[PDB]
Symmetry: D2
Subunit: 386 residues, 4 copies
């Protein structure tokens, strides 16, 4: 049964189990966690690696001697546990200088400072082993319409990601970027609000191949969108470089519940998709243990993230492996969807009378899709009533 292994590739941010509980209406309920303690406890839980924002590891404002003490300590913990660092990112949202954005701040000097802060952390991420560098532009956007010309801000956003592509190319680094979309919060509306908007943006950059997406369950659900559908389009585009797993219960503030909570059936269809498409990147949890919890509650919430992924993996595997489900898929013509519509081109199609002139539209309209039966088989597998 459900014990995490290194092969499950479960990772967690320093900021997830390290969340102190501070929210818009309340102070911290927990003490700050030491990164070294977090690496050790996560290694004991069966996680494979940890990720970080620069300001999680090195206190904003640290002198270069305090910086290397922090880095050194962290790296001894990693080396002692065998924990990996698959991804890293920059905090371009906490400090008041980023109140109007990092890469798309109206003030040019803030945009330059944002880029220098990011490059300093790309060098660190690369020596720690990170292959993905995430960008969450949480402050890029607006609360009012004339505060941001969005066509000019997209020029500044393209310009910042192109300069970053330039830099990693000239250094010969093997890192790839993954843009993390979110529709709103903390800005009234955030630029590149969904997976689709981030995908389309990448196609306009100088080096498209260096950039993919880091979609998060709760973010797409804050726009009422189907997260497994958005992940299937990112996989179809070859751009799912990383993923953030957690839970969200509707269109409201961003909750970051542990994975499995929130929309449980969407979590099931997501694990089924990730596992049958053979996604091989980290299964990263970007969640917040509720501020009602003490530190024992924090590790119970982190353990529940992994446990729920493994139960859903087991149930999805059993659903697809079941002969009855395989027969129900044929009955709903999922095999026929995999056949080309018109492989002999549009002239064969135009000549075929059975495709239009002689098509019996009413016989075809009367065929049932048998979708409810197939979805109740999926419901029975998820609940273990099969």
């Amino acid at each position: 049964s459900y014990q995490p292994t290194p092969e499950d590739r479960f990772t967690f941010g320093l900021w997830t189990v390290g969340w102190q509980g501070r929210d818009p209406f309340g102070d911290a309920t927990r003490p700050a966690l030491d990164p070294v303690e977090t690496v050790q406890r996560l290694a004991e839980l069966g996680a494979h690696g940890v990720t970080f924002h620069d300001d999680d590891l090195i206190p904003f404002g640290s002198s270069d001697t305090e910086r290397e003490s922090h880095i050194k300590r962290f790296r001894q913990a990693l080396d002692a546990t065998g924990m990996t660092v698959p991804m890293a990112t920059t905090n371009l949202f906490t400090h008041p200088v980023f109140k109007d954005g990092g890469f798309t701040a109206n003030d040019r000097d803030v945009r330059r400072y944002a880029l220098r802060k990011t490059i300093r952390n790309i060098d660190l991420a690369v020596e720690l082993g990170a292959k993905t560098y995430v960008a969450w532009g949480g402050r890029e956007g607006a609360e009012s319409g004339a505060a941001k010309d969005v066509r000019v801000a997209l020029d500044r956003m393209k310009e910042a990601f192109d300069l970053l592509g330039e830099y990693v190319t000239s250094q010969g680094y093997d890192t790839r970027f993954a843009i993390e979309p979110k529709p709103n919060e903390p800005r009234g509306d955030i630029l590149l609000p969904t997976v689709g908007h981030a995908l389309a943006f990448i196609e306009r950059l100088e080096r498209p191949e260096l950039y993919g997406v880091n979609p998060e369950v709760g973010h797409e659900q804050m726009a009422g969108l189907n997260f497994p559908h958005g992940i299937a389009q990112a996989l179809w585009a070859g751009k799912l470089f990383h993923i953030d797993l957690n839970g969200q219960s509707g269109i409201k503030y961003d909750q970051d519940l542990r994975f499995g909570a929130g929309d449980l059936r969407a979590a099931f269809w997501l694990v089924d998709l990730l596992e049958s498409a053979g996604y091989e990147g980290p299964r990263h949890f970007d969640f917040k243990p509720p501020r009602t919890e003490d530190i024992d509650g924090v590790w119970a919430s982190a353990a529940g993230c992994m446990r729920n992924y493994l139960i859903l993996k087991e149930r999805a595997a059993a659903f697809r492996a079941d002969p009855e489900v395989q027969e129900a898929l044929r009955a709903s013509r999922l095999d026929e969807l995999a056949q080309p519509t018109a492989a002999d081109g549009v002239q064969e199609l135009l000549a075929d009378r059975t495709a239009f002139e002689d098509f019996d539209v009413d016989a075809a309209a009367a065929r049932g899709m048998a979708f409810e039966r197939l979805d109740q088989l999926a419901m029975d597998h998820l609940l273990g009533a099969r």
Copy 2:
């Protein structure tokens, strides 16, 4: 003041003022309108053109002799009024044969029939003068997770749009396609749910240049997204081929209120963007006069669509033309957003100590953005209190 002219390029679908009032809980409240009567009345209201789905003009199932009677009659009305037909589209949603989709139906023969129905109407649209052919895949999607493999459905969707690109290319037609996104309704989740998802999809087609988007105000608002922001990204990508104007009051069923209703400030920021970016396509209204109205109420609702666009155009023009607003934009550093972040490349940026080492982060953090003052000037212009 606010009289529609031909230069305003206002157009309406046959199905908008022709909506009979039928909804999921109620029967029709109005009689069916004759297309000829609609062309004449819209021409009297000051509209520039009309659009149509094939089944609006020619009754589904018409023999080829009844088809040409309908077409002939319509074309005499257009010719008598000088009304244009800038866009046309296919109905791939009403008939029960399309219950699981047109282009991405699981049944291969339905997908072939969908493509033949569409090509027949592209030929008609081209001889009537349409330069844009819209595709709204209202039935492409699902209510349950195993009913549609979305990666395979995107293959079938790419395949259908590529066959259509093939066909118009081989015929030498000057039509371009515009995909119309919608997140849900009538399917639980519709494929390519937002402007961003449709933009990203286009980049994967064989002939990307033939395809753009037809975004609709209320559709992006059904996902709680900022519609002026999504339009600015489609304009930045060079893909705003057409637009559908109406109103929506929140995340709920698709209302199609007349333009100006619903989110009035978003309507203001949309007209400001369309007018200052010099969009030159039709201002098309895809709206439904509420079923509470009789035919006099239908033409009053259609007239209100145009009237509201012209009042907002006038207010947005006055906002941007005001010296005080121009001064407030400089104060919020909207001019500095138009300056390149690092035009002398990443090595100049890396060497600049003022960009990091010597950057006074606290002086910069303390600068106010002056955004509330600028937005209250915009509020005063919209309300005519300035």
Copy 3:
């Protein structure tokens, strides 16, 4: 196994399995079902009874001979199967005359007609043995602000329910009313939009005890509310007279999915609540088999409604029965929540220095609620991982 029997009190509307699949963008995909055939197919499935709108049983406009003939063949089917009719309701939304409302229509003659149509069906409901009479005011509301004065509409809505209470009291009928709330659709905004608004309104009627609520899963979820929370307040108020069970996947158009679909964890906490509070009314399913389905998919969807309630009942019962869960509830102090705050009274609380001046606020702040461990035990029980 999970076989329904009439002992489980499962009931279905004639309009549910009977929906023909017509939606805002599509025509019917199924033929009309004969009520007699519905009564015996539902009896075969293990249902306990059926409910109806007047217009589901007797076609609008039937002559009295035709009316009596429909009632006759229906009642014969009831007698033959042992099926009961627990509830009935009026259709005050389909006919065009109800386009601005039934009870709160601006036209006074339509409000009188709405009342006569309802009274006629109350007499029939009582003859068939219905104990609850539902009123869903789906047309009471507005799309625009000046169209409905809402304080005056609530006077007309109170007036209508007061006259229906006077009528059944004069007749000595044992029937009570249950108001069914819905936030929107088919009107832009519907009056009494949630459970709370309907509960508050009832306290203003002349005979408050004759009226309760008939909440529906998907309706409260269309406003992003927690449906188990809404039901606990209705049960706390002693007003849960009936309940409509189905599924909804978020804030969008009203889907009416089969129960168990949509928010599955909310369905689990709902069955946990109804079963532990000892609700004794009908478990009524107001759902629509998707229009993708044929008649065999209709009965599979209906059967799935009952199966899912019975699986969730079993898991909720096993959860509450588990000693480890019972121990986790004590650790989270749910036993202390049941203790009175200040049964000693106000002056004793004011004299209690340990309640304020000597309360150690930091020792209390430091106690973790242990809610994540508890919620993961609930997750394990729902998935059958114990």
Copy 4:
């Protein structure tokens, strides 16, 4: 012009212009404001009064000497400006001890502490002349289903309000309570989530007449509800004791934009309602100047709150005063809505053949409501296009 004077009853919380800009992803961008400076800058702006949470005026944990000193300098500022204190409230959400609630915390000692903290501030509110005492239960609720038994929590919530009613009655205080509803944030789901739920709960308290509601624009809009509709029901119930005015752009995190921003047409229909129903309470602004702003942007945002109410008051007044609008209201039969449906009574309605057996349902169905023309006249008046 639109200059506020104290005659307009505009009031502001100390926590509003006083917000320092700390949010879930960011630190403060503004220094703390001294209450004394807020009182005189707001008096200069034309405000009538200020409101407070205990912890806004007296820092949590102040010794009684420090407490009295804070109250002293505040009261001196009040006396010097002629500013009033119409309302006050308790902070039962910021301190970590309130992480699972104040009045419905699972820990009994915290619920007693919550009551003592509130009573202490009721005595201070009454001394400063407050007539309304608001209770916003922002921590009463849950993120998971078994963490809070909601029927027992509502017994504890009733118990707490009953004891506060007993306390002010024994003291002979002339102060009434107003419950402030909010659907979520900071808890996953908050108890009494909307106006209707709070209204329904009040009818179960021991002294219902001591309690009403303090609805907030953005809170009801976080559940997609019509705020003018919610306010008309509270006014119909005689329970609108206070109101919080601000803006919200849809269903997402609570934004607290300045009034007039967000849904501008809902702000117009809200001022129309408050002004035509003769609401006489404070027009209170509970908003947050965006963290992008400096202290000058704080006072511009505050001034904009008042300016927008005064512009919308003028347009709503001109709308209702227009003979053409008065004629349009008669055409839409808003005068007939005010007529009793059946003042002749139930048996006369039953004997009226014109109400049913001789009602021409198709002539009534054919009458248009003329609501679009009416709504466009309201649009013209709001935009000043007449």
